[PDB]
């Protein structure tokens, strides 16, 4: 119909216009590694772990913003796409507490599970790290914001899904953080889920912290019986 | 004899923006007397099509440092309309380091950049004009707003344009104190009232601009020539400086030169005869010179050899490793602490960055405190290559050209200054036993 | 480097070391380490179980 | 340096959301001029001047104009709260009489910016980040305010004293402090971002409307 | 005519208020502004 052909590594993949790199990626079972990116969160196009090399392009492209144009070869595993994963992943962890051990992500952290199969394996990172003070947003996230990739999921979370334009980012450069500025609780109907969606340690349970590691939790698929909604 | 092989020896009479130093009125009696809003009624009636090929005839790049063609960066708004508003943004951000240029375009010649507004914004089929100034010049757009009222008092701009039948605006917007809403997509968002953090592109503002409408980001003085381009043709302009470098230029000489200043001189002139000739020369002398940034602060250093031969234009100037830029020539003598000045520089990017994406967000403060470390010596020589790839990994995987523009003054400093950086890390090294 | 008893330790200002982590718990081979934690009541991570079956371990 | 300004507010005596804060009439005419020069549907883009206009009338932001302006607009105050904190001519903490902000950027840096910053931290007794116990005088460091070419340089309230020697920065806060209003400018005697040593171009007098114009227009 | 004299003079009395009365002055010369159709994005 009015699909287009574009290539995966060389394999043709037919897509709708409008498909972004990294949705045509996903169709033949590549997943791109992503921080900022939401399927159901605005596209940001800020933490850059997504960036892969099109082929005969100069330029490495945001595969989670980037239109797919007709005849496009993508280029997920090569040389370029792998040293620009290891650069961004470099310079995410620059900043990053060496907090694993008590931090509650450990065992499903996005962060750490993308640094073992898209990043280098040591640092030459010396200089000291910058740590923020932390937000108090309630009784049941916690925040321990030093852990902050500034990734701005809860923020789209927040104004877009929860209607709720409390969150925010004050500063700028090095010294930007999330946040609200003022003393204030994120209490929504909806807030836990800013938990689930953030990739890192710096949102967790206060209810569940320091209880359990996800690795020897048993899965109980259920479903709810708090409403109606099933 | 076509085909010019020396540049430079300007004539006053064809210089573009005559009253650059303020010397003459103003205000629009002056502007008038000095050739402006002439016989712009006629520019109008010509049409967008007639006003595109003129820019396009002209050659002339973008003088807000790019250098992309302007005729084809307008010619994107020439497509029908959608039922959006259509925008022109005239760029006056001016944030670059060594460069003072549409500040003297302002506050000296606004009815220029006025009239440039209309003429650009009829070839644009735009609506009306938003200039972008930043907050720290309060007196060049208190100028700016007195020319505009005067333009709308003389029916100029406004309802029924020059009586040329077309509706056209001119609003004036201050920034407040950020270097990084100069980029033309964290400027669209200033101006919309959030935070200037830069848009990714695609959508580029053609398509997506301010207030979500096609819009052209344009810098003043790219805008300033056109009315003057229109007048005296495209072919004039376009005999001026080497092939596909064409027109004039607003240079600013500073540093250690005896007379810092701010001239008009043809593309293609060289830089030495630039400096020796309207900045009164280097600081002691020609010998003394060390080393030069070219086009403002992002574009990387050049060191003395280099300097003597090379020509001021886009081309010659990236056959130099370097760029043409904003065309602020920094100098510096064989008295400057060469690693000094470029730590500066990496501290202005550091406090600039607007924070966004990563890879500028944390490389550049790491650059930073790493050029930090070798003022005093304190690193290991091979921290030196280091270095060089940190920047590599900032550059082309930014949101925006503030990580390239921090990569790239560190690169000139490793690429023709390593060195001095070894020299000092013995220094330390030896001193600190 | 002699294996022996197993002990925990402390900082030299009193303070247990370990933060339940656990990491010894995950990385045991013969599951001779069951670890429970909670918040202290200064909100410390620290565990209140860790037991060692000293008949499963291997040492 | 590490900027030592927080970017979280804690509530204070002095400011918090009961501290009194209003726009004056003709403040208010001023917002309404600038809230009609966008479009219906964009009244946010107002954002930036009206705030700023608020501190053009308070001296300073307290986070009562903040929740006043995004009352104004309709804006959330987190909007306005990012606004006020991204960009650094917004004061978020009260400042003196005079604000005085010295570029030291490499152009104006190669320039002996440092004698000036010394002078102005000598003659008033305090450092870059302080104020006077007088509450007169302010001073901090700034990037590149855009004079390059006339540096060193220094802003004071949205003027621009250029071409700066120690004396000259001296003898221009002993006129500040007396009360009177120092002319704005470069002071080596030269007018503007002219060569110093005889206007070396734009000497002959401009030419009239019409001189090179094409046929046919 | 003569190039001695500087003729930008006119800013050393501008007040704290200049450019926003130069705004409100030209508030009467601009044309009707264009509408979204909606009071704003979250209407
Ligand atoms: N005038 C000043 O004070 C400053 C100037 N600069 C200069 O800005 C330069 C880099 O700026 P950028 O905008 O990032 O360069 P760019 O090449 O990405 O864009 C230049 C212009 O051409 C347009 N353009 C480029 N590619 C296009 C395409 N494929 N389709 C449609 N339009 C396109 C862009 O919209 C833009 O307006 C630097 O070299 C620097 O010298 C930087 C800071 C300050
Ligand atoms: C960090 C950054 C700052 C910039 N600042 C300015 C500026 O102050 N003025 C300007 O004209 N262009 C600036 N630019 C370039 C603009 O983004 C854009 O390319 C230019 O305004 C286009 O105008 P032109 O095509 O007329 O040159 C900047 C770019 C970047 C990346
Ligand atoms: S967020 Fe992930 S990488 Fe960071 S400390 Fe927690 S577990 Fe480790
Ligand atoms: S708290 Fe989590 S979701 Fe929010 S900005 Fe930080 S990393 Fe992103
Ligand atoms: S490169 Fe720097 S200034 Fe540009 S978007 Fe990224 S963080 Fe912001
Ligand atoms: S849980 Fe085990 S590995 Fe973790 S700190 Fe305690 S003793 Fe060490
Ligand atoms: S996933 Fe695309 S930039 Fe973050
Ligand atoms: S370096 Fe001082 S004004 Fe630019
Ligand atoms: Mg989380």
Redesign the pocket.
């Known amino acids: 119909s009015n699909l287009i052909e574009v290539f995966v590594d060389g394999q043709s993949v037919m897509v709708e216009p409008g498909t972004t790199v990294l949705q045509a990626c996903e169709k033949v079972g590549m997943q791109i590694p992503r921080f900022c990116y939401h399927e159901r969160l605005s596209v940001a196009g800020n933490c850059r772990m997504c960036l892969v090399e099109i082929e005969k392009a100069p330029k490495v492209v945001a595969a989670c913003a980037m239109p797919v144009m007709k005849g496009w070869n993508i280029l997920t595993n090569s040389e370029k796409s792998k040293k620009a994963r290891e650069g961004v992943m470099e310079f995410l962890l620059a900043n990053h507490p060496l907090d694993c051990p008590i931090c509650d992500q450990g065992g499903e952290c996005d962060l750490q599970d993308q640094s073992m199969m898209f990043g280098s394996d040591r640092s030459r990172f010396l200089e000291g790290k910058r740590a923020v003070e932390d937000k108090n947003i309630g009784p049941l996230v916690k925040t321990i914001m030093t852990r902050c990739i500034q990734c701005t999921r809860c923020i789209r979370f927040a104004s877009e899904i929860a209607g709720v334009d409390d969150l925010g980012t004050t500063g700028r450069g090095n010294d930007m953080q999330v946040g609200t500025y003022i003393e204030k609780m994120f209490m929504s109907e909806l807030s836990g889920n800013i938990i689930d969606i953030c990739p890192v340690g710096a949102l967790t349970s206060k209810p569940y912290a320091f209880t359990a590691r996800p690795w020897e939790t048993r899965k109980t698929e259920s479903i709810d019986v708090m409403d109606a909604v099933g | 004899a076509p085909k010019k092989t020396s540049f430079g020896s300007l004539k006053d009479e064809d210089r573009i923006f005559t009253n650059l130093y303020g010397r003459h009125d103003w205000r629009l009696k002056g502007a008038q007397s000095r050739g402006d809003w002439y016989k712009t009624k006629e520019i109008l009636l010509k049409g967008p099509d007639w006003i595109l090929g003129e820019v396009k005839t002209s050659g002339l790049r973008?003088?807000?440092?790019?250098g992309?063609p302007?005729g084809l960066?307008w010619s994107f708004m020439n497509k029908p309309s959608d039922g959006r508003p259509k925008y022109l943004v005239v760029?006056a951000?001016?944030?670059?380091p060594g460069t003072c240029k549409?500040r003297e375009i302002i506050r000296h010649d606004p009815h220029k950049l006025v009239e440039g507004c209309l003429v650009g914004g009829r070839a644009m089929g735009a609506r009306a004009a938003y200039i972008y100034i930043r907050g720290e010049f309060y007196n060049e757009a208190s100028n700016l707003q007195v020319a505009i009222r005067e333009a709308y008092e003389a029916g100029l701009i406004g309802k029924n344009a020059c009586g040329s039948g077309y509706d056209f605006d001119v609003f004036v917007v201050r920034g407040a104190g950020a270097?990084?809403c100069?980029?033309?997509t964290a400027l669209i968002e200033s101006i919309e009232g959030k935070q200037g953090k830069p848009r990714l592109k695609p959508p580029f503002p053609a398509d997506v601009g301010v207030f979500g409408c096609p819009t052209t980001?344009?810098?003043?003085e790219?805008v300033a020539v056109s009315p003057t381009i229109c007048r005296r043709g495209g072919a004039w302009f376009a005999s001026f400086g080497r092939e596909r470098n064409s027109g004039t230029k607003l240079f600013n000489i500073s540093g250690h030169v005896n007379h810092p200043c701010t001239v008009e001189e043809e593309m293609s002139v060289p830089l030495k005869e630039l400096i020796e000739k309207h900045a009164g020369g280097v600081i002691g002398g020609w010998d003394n010179l060390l080393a030069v940034i070219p086009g403002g602060s992002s574009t990387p250093l050049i060191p003395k050899s280099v300097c003597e031969t090379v020509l001021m234009d886009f081309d010659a100037l990236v056959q130099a490793q370097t760029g043409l830029g904003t065309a602020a020539v920094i100098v510096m003598d064989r008295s400057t602490d060469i690693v000094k000045a470029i730590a500066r520089l990496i501290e202005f990017y550091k406090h600039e960055s607007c924070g966004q994406c990563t890879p500028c967000r944390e490389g550049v403060d790491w650059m930073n405190k790493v050029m930090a470390r070798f003022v005093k010596g304190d690193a290991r020589p091979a921290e030196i290559d280091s270095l060089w790839e940190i920047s590599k990994q900032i550059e082309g995987h930014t949101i925006?050209?503030?990580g390239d523009?921090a990569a790239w003054p560190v690169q000139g400093l490793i690429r023709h200054f390593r060195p001095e950086l070894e020299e000092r890390m013995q220094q330390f090294a030896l001193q600190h036993q | 480097r002699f294996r022996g008893e197993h002990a925990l330790r402390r900082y030299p200002s009193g303070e247990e070391r370990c933060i339940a982590c656990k990491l010894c718990e995950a990385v045991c081979p013969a599951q001779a380490i069951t670890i429970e934690a909670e918040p202290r009541a200064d909100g410390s991570r620290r565990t209140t179980r860790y037991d060692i079956d000293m008949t499963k371990c291997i040492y | 340096g590490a900027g030592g300004a927080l970017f979280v507010h804690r509530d204070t005596p002095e400011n918090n959301p009961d501290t009194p804060f209003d726009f004056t009439p003709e403040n208010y005419k001023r917002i309404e001029a600038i809230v009609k020069n966008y479009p219906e549907g964009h009244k946010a883009a107002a954002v930036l001047p009206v705030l700023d206009l608020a501190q053009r009338q308070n001296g300073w932001l307290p986070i009562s104009a903040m929740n006043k302006v995004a009352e104004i607009l309709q804006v959330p105050p987190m909007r306005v709260y990012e606004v006020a904190t991204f960009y650094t001519m917004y004061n978020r903490k009260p400042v003196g009489k005079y604000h005085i902000q010295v570029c030291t950027t490499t152009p104006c840096m190669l320039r002996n910016s440092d004698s000036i910053l010394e002078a102005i931290q000598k003659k008033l007794g305090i450092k870059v980040g302080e104020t006077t116990p007088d509450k007169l005088f302010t001073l901090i460091e700034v990037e590149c305010l855009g004079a390059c070419v006339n540096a060193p340089m220094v802003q004071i309230n949205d003027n621009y004293y250029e071409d700066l020697t120690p004396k000259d920065i001296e003898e221009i806060i002993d006129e500040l402090k007396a009360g009177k209003i120092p002319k704005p400018g470069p002071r080596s005697g030269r007018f503007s971002c002219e060569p110093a040593g005889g206007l070396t171009s734009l000497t002959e007098p401009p030419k009239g409307p019409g001189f090179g114009v094409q046929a046919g227009l | 005519f003569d190039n001695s004299t500087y003729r930008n003079l006119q800013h050393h009395e501008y007040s704290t208020y200049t450019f926003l009365d130069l705004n409100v002055e030209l508030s009467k010369f601009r044309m009707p502004q264009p509408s979204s159709g909606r009071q704003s994005p979250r209407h």
């Not at chain 2, 973008?62 to 790019?66: L, V």
């Not at chain 2, 951000?93 to 670059?96: F, M, N, V």
């Not at chain 2, 980001?217 to 003043?220: E, I, L, Q």
């Open positions: 973008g003088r807000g440092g790019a992309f302007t960066k760029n951000d001016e944030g670059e549409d270097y990084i100069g980029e033309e980001v344009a810098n003043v790219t925006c050209a503030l523009g």
